[PDB]
């Protein structure tokens, strides 16, 4: 007969099947094998510590009550309307902020009952997970964005999740992010919570987002470094030309202050110190030291002009070595040591 009528003969109000009771009741816990297939991975914002995904969640399990060997069609499938007549594992995402199904042209979910009792459930969810990023070393950071599936009111001896055998988490092939790159090293583990009541089951997949810094290396480091070079060539050459020296000093400290405090609207607003902020502050300190050493040579000037030019030449030899020492001790620290 028809799959609808045979289905309601199998799982209706009659025939002894309560949806509100788990299969294998008073026995071994069910093994809900679930996997995800993510489509979009966007808006990894730093002002709210979240990221939005749009996944396909497919979970399979067993129940002896939905078994049959009398019907021609081997895998029945019920419409997404009457999904309240089958027990479903009551999972939820342990850290999601906002999340919702999709309802374009139909309900985007599916439930198939195989002949061997294997029940297959597939949803299309949109989630906004919460990942606690740290921007301590900002333009060279590596973030771990996690996603945890968990049960809601079923203990480990009542229900357990476990990932699929092969390919439990797989992204779409053509996705890309504005700032980060989603690496191909995702880690799949268990983080089972040991709460006050019992050990509620939970599984976790963590993605590694690695930030690329071409934009910052072009438009945040190089202008300030060239400004520092100009700050040195101020007093490297112009010995006696004081109006051709004070002007370069004013302009270089002014353009460095403008570069430092007019490029913070394009950086994520946090309050702890970032790497780019340390570098900006050290460049500001260096141009300040350039202007101060000019003023010191001018002070010691007004029988001693040889000592004045000697201090000038010693500073012109010491500033590049000092900046190379800082630059090395910064780059080997942030790029190779903390990575």
């Amino acid at each position: 007969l028809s799959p609808s009528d045979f289905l309601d003969k199998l799982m209706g109000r009659t025939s002894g099947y309560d949806a509100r009771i788990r299969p294998n009741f008073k026995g071994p816990p069910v093994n809900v094998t679930c996997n995800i297939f993510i489509n979009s991975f966007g808006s990894v914002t730093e002002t709210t510590m979240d990221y939005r995904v749009n996944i396909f969640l497919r979970q399979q399990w067993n129940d002896s009550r939905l078994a049959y060997s009398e019907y021609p069609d081997d895998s029945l499938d019920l419409d997404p309307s009457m999904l309240d007549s089958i027990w479903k594992p009551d999972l939820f995402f342990a850290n999601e902020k906002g999340a919702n199904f999709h309802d374009v042209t139909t309900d985007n979910k599916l439930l198939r009952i195989s002949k061997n009792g294997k029940v297959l459930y597939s949803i299309r969810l949109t989630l906004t997970l919460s990942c606690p990023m740290d921007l301590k070393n900002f333009p060279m950071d590596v973030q771990t964005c996690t996603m945890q599936l968990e049960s809601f009111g079923y203990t480990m001896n009542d229900l357990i999740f476990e990932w699929l055998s092969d390919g439990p988490v797989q992204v779409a092939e053509g996705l890309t992010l504005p700032q980060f790159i989603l690496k191909e090293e995702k880690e799949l583990g268990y983080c089972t919570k040991h709460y006050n009541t019992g050990k509620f089951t939970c599984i976790e997949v963590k993605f590694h987002l690695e930030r690329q810094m071409g934009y910052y290396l072009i438009q945040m480091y190089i202008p300030s470094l060239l400004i520092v070079i100009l700050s040195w060539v101020s007093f490297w050459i112009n010995m006696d030309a004081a109006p051709a020296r004070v002007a370069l000093g004013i302009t270089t400290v002014l353009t460095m202050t403008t570069q430092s405090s007019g490029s913070r609207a394009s950086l994520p607003k946090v309050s702890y110190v970032k790497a780019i902020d340390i570098w900006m502050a050290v460049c500001l300190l260096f141009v300040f030291a350039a202007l101060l050493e000019y003023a010191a040579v001018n002070f010691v000037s007004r029988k001693f002009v040889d000592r004045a030019k000697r201090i000038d030449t010693i500073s012109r030899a010491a500033f590049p070595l000092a900046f190379l020492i800082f630059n090395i001790f910064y780059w080997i620290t942030y790029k190779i040591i903390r990575h």
Partner: protein
């Protein structure tokens, strides 16, 4: 509807013999039908008042809209004494008549449904029905920020009837403390309970009747301290700097060059940097008048440098005239736009 009974004693049996099963209490027809106008007694209680977006002309506010009226068809019988306030649950909130008010200048209003529904209804002994409901409205008030850093915005919230004229429904305030509010901190403005001025204002919509209405008018005075210690005193300091730059010697020197080329550059890079922080509104604000006056004075300083080096006799007049010419403008501007 047609269910016989479940209980006889408690506060649900009286509702079952009061409406939807017993004698017809039609919840579509108003009390005193074709008689006198019903008198609804409203009094909001503000819990939150914020997000006054000067780009959309709105403000969000969370109220407790209590409204209490007199329904003679719900006269509680004298069978009991403990049911002085027969509390009906919001499952039957639609089985009794309720006045259909609405905010005539809202934008997107919605209820609250946390852990339960946030509507409470009481039915008293003498027929007085009371409805409290938590509400989260976002009304619209036309902000006119011409006097921007010193302006006072009045924003009003008006309750109205929707389909019932003045001879059918009529709103009156509680007449004792009708608009209360908690201690709330606006980010930029300053709400004050000293001016919470309210009143009735019914509208005469043509052809169809004369609809009732009440309104509250909050007054908000935008505090000025950040702008005064921000884009007022440093900009005045820049202009005074470019005035005092007339005291450096021109004779056999080259150090007035930076004090000019950096005075005008600094005032311009203050003006057009401020031009993004201000609310994006395209008419003349008082702050913009101040900024263009300070830029005119920097330009006047540099053109005075030009005219003393294209023509002792002009510098001694400029130093005593133009820093004295600032004062008349600084008096008339703070007398007009304040």
């Amino acid at each position: 509807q047609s269910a016989e009974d479940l209980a006889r004693v408690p506060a649900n049996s009286t509702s079952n013999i009061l409406n939807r099963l017993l004698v017809s209490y039609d919840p579509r027809i108003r009390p005193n039908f074709k008689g006198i106008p019903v008198d609804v007694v409203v009094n909001i209680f503000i819990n939150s008042f914020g997000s006054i977006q000067e780009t959309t002309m709105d403000y969000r506010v969370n109220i407790f809209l209590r409204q209490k009226w007199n329904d003679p068809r719900l006269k509680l019988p004298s069978d009991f004494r403990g049911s002085d306030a027969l509390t009906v649950d919001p499952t039957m909130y639609k089985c009794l008549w309720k006045p259909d008010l609405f905010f005539a200048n809202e934008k997107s209003a919605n209820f609250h449904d946390v852990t339960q529904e946030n509507i409470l209804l009481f039915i008293f002994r003498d027929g007085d029905v009371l409805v409290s409901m938590r509400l989260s409205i976002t009304l619209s008030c036309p902000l006119d920020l011409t006097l921007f850093p010193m302006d006072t915005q009045r924003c009003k919230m008006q309750l109205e009837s929707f389909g019932y004229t003045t001879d059918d429904l009529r709103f009156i305030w509680q007449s004792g403390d009708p608009v209360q509010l908690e201690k709330i901190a606006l980010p930029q403005f300053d709400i004050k309970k000293e001016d919470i001025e309210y009143g009735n204002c019914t509208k005469y919509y043509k052809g169809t009747g004369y609809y009732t209405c009440v309104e509250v008018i909050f007054t908000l005075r935008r505090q000025v301290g950040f702008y005064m210690m921000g884009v007022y005193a440093p900009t005045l300091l820049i202009v005074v700097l470019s005035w005092l730059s007339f005291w450096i010697n021109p004779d056999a020197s080259a150090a007035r060059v930076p004090l000019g080329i950096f005075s005008v550059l600094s005032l311009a890079s203050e003006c057009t940097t401020l031009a993004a922080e201000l609310p994006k509104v395209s008419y003349v604000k008082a702050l913009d008048v101040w900024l263009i006056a300070c830029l005119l004075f920097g330009f006047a300083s540099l053109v005075e440098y030009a005219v003393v080096q294209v023509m002792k006799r002009i510098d001694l007049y400029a130093r005593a005239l133009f820093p004295f010419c600032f004062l008349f403008f600084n008096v008339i501007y703070w007398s007009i736009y304040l």
